[PDB]
């Protein structure tokens, strides 16, 4: 089965591009990352930074997670991200996603050894 670190890379990492190219980016990526198979994941965020830069956030600002967990870290600088959200009219399997590109700090929960990101908590 998939490890938590590998699942985080598959669902959130997109270092091949510097930002969402078009409004079809989310439809494209949600499908090729396997996030619309048993159902469509309604919300997902992609980070357009190198994997080393995203793993480095686990040694940056330690903050509380949205669920009260204390293993979340906020990046010191902003990062290029793309928010993919299902529209009120998306019907599985024909999942329609709105793509919103932005520059913000990311907040991730880190775990294990090596200490790496395993959950995307939010962005600010």
Curated annotation (Swiss-Prot):
Under the cellular component aspect of Gene Ontology, which terms does the record hold?
extracellular region
Q: Which GO terms describe its biological process?
A: defense response to Gram-positive bacterium
Q: Which UniProt keywords apply?
A: Disulfide bond, Endonuclease, Glycation, Glycoprotein, Hydrolase, Lyase, Nuclease, Secreted, Signal
- The answer to whether the entry has keyword DNA-binding is no
The UniProt entry annotates the active site at 12 (proton acceptor), 119 (proton donor)
Enzyme class, top EC level, equals: lyase
Tell me which residues bind substrate.
Answer: 7, 10, 41-45, 66, 85
Q: Which GO terms describe its molecular function?
A: lyase activity; nucleic acid binding; ribonuclease A activity; RNA nuclease activity
Family named by the database record: Belongs to the pancreatic ribonuclease family.
- The name this protein goes by in its record: Ribonuclease pancreatic
Name the source organism: Bos taurus
Q: What is the lineage of its organism?
A: Eukaryota, Metazoa, Chordata, Craniata, Vertebrata
Q: Which residues of the full protein are shown?
A: 27 to 150 of 150
